[PDB]
Amino acid sequence: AASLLINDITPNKTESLKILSTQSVGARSLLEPMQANASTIKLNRIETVNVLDFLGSVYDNTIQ
Amino acid sequence: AASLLINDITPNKTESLKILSTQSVGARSLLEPMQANASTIKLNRIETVNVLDFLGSVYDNTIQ
Amino acid sequence: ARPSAQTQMAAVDMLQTINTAASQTAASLLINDITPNKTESLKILSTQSVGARSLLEPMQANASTIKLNRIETVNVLDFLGSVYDNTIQVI
Amino acid sequence: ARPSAQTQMAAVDMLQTINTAASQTAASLLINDITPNKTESLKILSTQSVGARSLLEPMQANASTIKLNRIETVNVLDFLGSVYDNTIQVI
Amino acid sequence: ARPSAQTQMAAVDMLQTINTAASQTAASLLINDITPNKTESLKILSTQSVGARSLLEPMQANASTIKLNRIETVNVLDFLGSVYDNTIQVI
Amino acid sequence: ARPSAQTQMAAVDMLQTINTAASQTAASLLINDITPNKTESLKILSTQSVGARSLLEPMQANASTIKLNRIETVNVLDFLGSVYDNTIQVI
Amino acid sequence: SAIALYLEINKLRLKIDEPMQLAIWPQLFPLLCDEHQSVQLNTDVLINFMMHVARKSQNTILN
Amino acid sequence: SAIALYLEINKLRLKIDEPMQLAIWPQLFPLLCDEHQSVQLNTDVLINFMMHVARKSQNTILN
Amino acid sequence: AIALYLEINKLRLKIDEPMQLAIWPQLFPLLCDEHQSVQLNTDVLINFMMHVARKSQNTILNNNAAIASQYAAGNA
Amino acid sequence: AIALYLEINKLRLKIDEPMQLAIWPQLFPLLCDEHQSVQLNTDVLINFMMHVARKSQNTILNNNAAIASQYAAGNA
Amino acid sequence: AIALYLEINKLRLKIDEPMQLAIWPQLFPLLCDEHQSVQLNTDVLINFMMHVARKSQNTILNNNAAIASQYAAGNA
Amino acid sequence: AIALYLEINKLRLKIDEPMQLAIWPQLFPLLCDEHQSVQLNTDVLINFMMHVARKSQNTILNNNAAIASQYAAGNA
Amino acid sequence: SAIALYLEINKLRLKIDEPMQLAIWPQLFPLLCDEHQSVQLNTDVLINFMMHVARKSQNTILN
Amino acid sequence: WPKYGGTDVNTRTVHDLLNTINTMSARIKTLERYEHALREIHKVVVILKPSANTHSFEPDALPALIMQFLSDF
Amino acid sequence: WPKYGGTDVNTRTVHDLLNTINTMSARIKTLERYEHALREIHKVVVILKPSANTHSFEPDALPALIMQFLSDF
Amino acid sequence: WPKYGGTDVNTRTVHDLLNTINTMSARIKTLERYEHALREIHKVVVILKPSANTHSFEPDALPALIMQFLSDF
Amino acid sequence: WPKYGGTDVNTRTVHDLLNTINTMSARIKTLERYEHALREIHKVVVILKPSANTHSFEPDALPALIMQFLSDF
Amino acid sequence: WPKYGGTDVNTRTVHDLLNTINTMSARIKTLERYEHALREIHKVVVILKPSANTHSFEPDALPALIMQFLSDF
Amino acid sequence: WPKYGGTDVNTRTVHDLLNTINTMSARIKTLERYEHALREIHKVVVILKPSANTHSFEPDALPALIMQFLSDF
C-alpha cells in the first residue's frame, strides 16, 4: 500500500479519514480544519513548511 | 513470542495483564496507574527515562 | 609513476600564463573596479547584459538605495548568474 | 616495504603547505579573533550565515547576556555546525 | 629473525615522541595540577564533564568535606571513568 | 646447538633490567620498609588492600599485640596472598 | 524562516511540478514576503493539490 | 539528568520515529526544561504510543 | 512571480546553496504582486555583486589550476 | 520544537557526543512553548563558539595530516 | 539506585577489580533511598581522583610502548 | 568459619604447603564461633608478613630469570 | 564485608538479571549501606526470586 | 561524483592535485633556500664595506652591488 | 563520499587543494627572481676567480665563496 | 570502521601514521643534533673573542658572526 | 575494535597520532634553519681552509673544525 | 586472551616486548660506557689543570672545557 | 595461562615489561647527551692531532688520547 493510495481511495469529500490516519505519524494540523468541514484553511509559514515536507514524504514513502 | 506481541494480543483496555507480567522484569511504575484505571499518568524525568529504555528494549527483545 | 618535476613545473608555467589571461573576465572587471560604486565596470558590462544597465543607471546617480521591480530584479539576477558562469565576454 | 625517508618528508612539506592554506577557515577566523567579543569574525561570517548575524548584533552592543528564541537558537546551532563541517567559505 | 637494533631504536624514538604527545591527556592534567585542591585541572575539565563541575564548585570553596547525592556521585564516577578511558579531549 | 655466549649475556642484561623494574613490587616495598613496624609500607598499601588498613591501624599505635577477628583475619590473609601473587600495583 | 519555506518549496517542486505551473505556488508565495502573517486558501484548492501529489506519486508507483 | 532523558529520547527515536512526528515527543519535552516537575499525560496517549512501538516492533519482526 | 522564483533558485545553486546572503529575503517581497517594487540599499547590492564576482573568479582560477594539474598528469 | 531538538542532536554528534557542555541544558528550555526565549550569558556562548572552532580546526588539520601520510604511503 | 550500582561496577572494572579503595563503602550508602546524601572528606575524593589519574596515565603510556614494540616487530 | 578455613588453605598453598609457620595454629581459634577474636603478638604478624614478602620477591625474581633464560634459548 | 556482598550481587546479576530490573536488588541494597543490621523481606518475594532463578536456569538447560 | 566548480571530486583528482602540490612545495623550498643564500651574501657584502652597504636588502640589486664592489676594488 | 587511502574526500578538499596550488604558484613566480640573482652571483665568482667550488653550483657554499672572493680584492 | 573526523580507524591507518611519525622523529633528532652542533660552535666562537661574543646565542647570526670574526682577523 | 599487532586501536589512538604528526611538523619547520646555518658554517670552513674533514660533512666534527680554523687566523 | 590495558597477553606479545627490552638494554649499556668515558676524560682534564678544573663534573661542558684548555695552551 | 617457553605469563608480566620499556626509554633519552659530548671530544682529538687511534672511534681509548693530546700542548 501507500499513503497517497489511501488518500486517493478515501471516499470522503474532505478525506479526513486518511488525514486522521496519517496525522498520527505526520505533523498535519490539516486534520482539524478538514474534519470541521471548513471552507478555507489559514496556513502560516511554519505549518506550510510541514505541509510541504509531508507531501514530499508521502510522495516517496510513509507506509505505516 | 515477544513482549510487544503479548502487549498487542492483550485484550484489556489498559493491558494491565501484560504490564504486570513484564514489570516483574522491567522497571515500570506504569503498572499501578494502569491497573487503577487512572485517566492520566504523572511522569517525572526519572520514570520517563525508564519508560523510554523499556520501550526500546521491548522493541528489540525482552522475551521471558 | 608520478609525473617528473619538470612536467609539474611546466604545468605551473602554463597555469600562471592562463591565469594572467583569466585576469580579463567580467568577474575580475567587477573586482578591480576601484570606483566607490561599480560605475566603470558596469559601463563596460552594460554592452553585454541588461541587468548591468539597470544597476548602472542609479549607481551613476549615487543613490543611497535602488528600487527594483520584478523584471529588473530578474535581469540583475541573470547578470550575476552570467558573471558566475563567465559567459560575458569583455572586449 | 615502508616508504623512503624522502617520500615521508615530501609528504611533510605538503602537509605544512596545506595547513598554511587551512589557516583561512571559518574556525580559524573565529580562533584568531582577538576582539573581546568575536565582533570582527562575526562581521566577516555574517555574509555567510544567519546565525552569525544573530550573534553579531548583540555582541557589538556589548551585552552581558543575549536572549535567543527558538529560531535564533536553531540558526546559531546551524552556524556552529557549519563551522565544524567547514562549509563556510571565507573570501 | 629478531628486528635489527636500528629498527628497535627507531621504535623507541617513536615511543618518546608519542609519549610527549600523551602528556596532554586529562589524566596527566589532573596529575600535574600542583594546586592543593585540583582547582585548575577541574576548571579545565568542567568544559568536558558534568562531574568535573560538581567536584569543582566545592573544591574552590576549600571545603573540608563534600556532600554528594546519587546524581552527583554518578556524574563523578562517570567523570573518573572517562579519565581512565581517555575520552576527554583537553583543548 | 646451545645459544651463543653473546645471546646468553644479552639475556643477562635483560634480566638485570627487568629485576631493577621488579624492585617496585609490594613484596619489595614490605621488605625495604626499615621502620620497626611496617608503617610506611602499610600506609602505601592501605590504598590497595583492606588487610593493609587493618594491620596498619594498630601498628601505628605501637601495640605489642593485635586483636583480629574472623573478618579482619580473612582480609589480612588475602592481603598476604595478594603480596605473593604480586597483584597489588604500587603506584 | 522564509529561507526554509523557499527551500522546501523547491524540494517539493523538483518532484511534483518542475516548471511551477500550479496556482498554489503563487498562492503560497506571500508567506516568503512579509513576517507575522498567514495565507487563507480554499479547502478545495488544498485538497486538489494533495490529490495532485497523489496522482504524481501514483505515476511514480506505476513506474 | 536532563541530558540522560534527551539521549534516551534520541535512542528511542532512532528506532520508533526518525522524524519525530508523534505528539508524545513535544509532550515529553517539558521534562528537559525545568527541574523538580512532572508531565501529566493521558493513559490513552501513553498506551497508544506503546502500541505504536508494538506495531513498529511487529514490522521489524516480520522483517 | 514564477520566473523570479526560479531565477533566484538558479543563482542560488550557483552562488549560495543554503541561501544565507541577506539579499534573498530582501528580494522575496517581489514574489507578491502587491509588492511591485522593493527599495534596496545600494551598498547591499554592491556587496552581493562582489560576493558573486570574487566567488566566480576564484572558481575560474581553480578550474585553471585543475586543468594544469591534469595536464601534468598526462592521462586526461 | 522538533527542529530545535534535532538540530541540537546534529551539533551534538559533531561536537559533543556525551553532551557535557553547559550550553545544552541552558538551550533545553526552548523546547517548551512557554519558554519563548532564554537569557544566556554572552561569555558562555563565546566559549561554546570557541570550543566548536578549536575542535573544528584541530579536526581539519588532522585530516590534512592523514591525507599527507596516505600520500606518503602511495597506495591510496 | 540501580544506575549508581552499575556505574560503580563499571568504574570498578576499570580501576579496582577487588574493590579495595576506601571510597567504595563510603559511596555504598547512596544505594539506600534514606541516605539521600553522603558527606565525604575532600582529601579522600582527591586521592581517589589521583589514583584513577595515575593508573590511567600509566596505562596510556604502556599502550604506547606496546604499539612501538609491535611496530618494531613489523608483523602487526 | 568456612571462608576463613578456605582462605587459610589458599595462602597455605601459596606460602607454606606443610603449614609449619607458627601463625597457623594461632589463627585456628577463629574457626570456633566462641573465639570471636584472637590476641596475636605484633612481632609474630610482622615476621609472617616478612616471610610472605621475601618468598614472593624471590619467586618474582626467579620467574624473571627463567624468562631471560628461555629468551636466550630462543625456542619459547 | 559489604564489598563481598556487592561482588556476589554482581556475580549473580551477570547470570540472572543483566540490567537489574528485579525489585529484589533495591530490597537487598541496604545491606551495603549500614553495619550491624538486616533486611526483612517477604517469603513470597524471596521464593518468587528463587523460582525466577529456576526459570532462568531452565532456559539455560533447554539451550 | 561530487563536484567543485567544473572538477569531479574523487580519488584520482585528489591524487593529481597532491602530486602537483608536492612538486611545487619542493620548488618553494628550493627557492626559499636561494633567498636565504642571497641574504647571507648580502651580509657578507655589508661586513666588507659597511660604510655604504647598510642601506637596505634588495635581491635584484645585490648582483650589481657585488659587481660595483669589484669595480671600486 | 570518495576516499583517498581511507580519508574522506569532499568538495572542500579539492577546493582547498586548488587554492593551495594557486597561492603556491604566485609565491613561486615571486621567488624565481631569487634564483636568477643567486646564479648571477655564482657566475661572477666563477668567472673572476676560477677555483674549487666554482666548479659546482651550491647555494650553501656561495656566501662563503663571496667572502673569500671579495676579501681577496 | 570506527572513524576519527574523516579518517577510518584500522590497522593500516595506524601503520601509515606510525611510518610517518618514525621518519619525522628521525628528522627531528637529526635537526636537534644540528642545533647542538651550532651551540658548540657558538661556544668556540665565544672563547675565541669573549670580549664581544658573550651577548646572546642566535643560530641565524652565528654564520655571519663567524664571517665577521674572519673579517676582523 | 581493530588491533595493531594485538594492541587495541580506537579513534583516540588515531587522533593522538595525527596530533603528534602536526606538532612534529611545526617543530621540524622551526628546526630547518639550524641545518641551513650549520651547513653554511661548514662551507665557510671548507672554502677558506681546504683540509681533512672539510671533505665530508660531519656535524659532530664541525665545532672542532671551527676551533682549529678560527684559532689559525 | 588475558589483557593488560589494550594489549593481548600471549607468547608473541611477551617475545616482542623482550626483543625491545634486549635492544634497549644494550643501548643503555653503551651509553653508560660513554658516561664512564666522559668521567675519565674529566679526571684527565682535572689532573692537567687542577687549579681550575676541580669545580664540578658536567658532561655538556666538558667538550667546551677541553676546547678552552686548548685555547689557554 | 599463556606460556613463554614454559614459564607462565600473566597480565602483570606484560605490565612489568611495558613499565620497563618506558623507564628505559626515559633513561636512554637522558643518556644520549653523553654520546654526543663524547663524540665531540673524539673529533677534537682527531682534528687537532691526526694520529693512530684518531682513525677509529673507541670510547675506552679516548681518555688516554686526551691525556696524550692535552699533555702535548
Residue numbers in the entry:
A (entry chain E), B (entry chain E): 54 to 117
C (entry chain C), D (entry chain C), E (entry chain C), F (entry chain C): 29 to 119
G (entry chain F), H (entry chain F), M (entry chain F): 2 to 64
I (entry chain D), J (entry chain D), K (entry chain D), L (entry chain D): 3 to 78
N (entry chain A), O (entry chain B), P (entry chain A), Q (entry chain B), R (entry chain A), S (entry chain B): 4 to 76
Could you give the paper's own sentences about this structure?
The most well-studied baculovirus is Autographa californica multiple nucleopolyhedrovirus (AcMNPV). Baculoviruses have their large circular dsDNA genome packaged into an enveloped rod-shaped nucleocapsid. The BV nucleocapsid structure consists of three parts, a central helical sheath containing the viral genome, an apical cap and a basal structure attached to both extremities of the helical sheath. Herein, we report high-resolution cryo-electron microscopy (cryo-EM) structures of the BV nucleocapsid combined with de novo modeling and Alphafold predictions.
It has a maximum and minimum diameter of 23 and 10 nm respectively. The asymmetric unit of the C21 ring observes a distinctive ‘sickle’ shape, characterized by a straight vertical ‘handle’ domain, connected to a ‘hook’ domain. Thanks to a higher resolution for this ring structure (3.5 Å), the extensive modeling analysis indicated three different proteins, each one in two copies, contributing to form this crown-like C21 ring. The handle region comprises a dimeric Ac66, spanning N-terminal amino acids 4-75, with the remaining amino acids of Ac66 conspicuously absent in the C21 ring structure. The ‘hook’ portion of the asymmetric unit consists of two sets, each constituted of two proteins: Ac101 and Ac102. The first set, encompassing N-terminal amino acids 29-119 of Ac102 and 2-78 of Ac101, is positioned closer and perpendicular to the handle part of the assembly whereas the second set, including amino acids 54-117 of Ac102 and 2-63 of Ac101, is located at the tip of the hook. Within an asymmetric unit, Ac101 pairs up with Ac102 in a heterodimeric arrangement. The interaction between these two proteins is pervasive, extending intimately across the entire modeled length of both proteins, with a spectacular β-strands pairing forming an intermolecular β-sheet. Ac102 of the first set engages in intermolecular interactions with Ac66 through various polar interactions including a potential salt bridge between the Lys32 of Ac66 with Asp41 of Ac102.
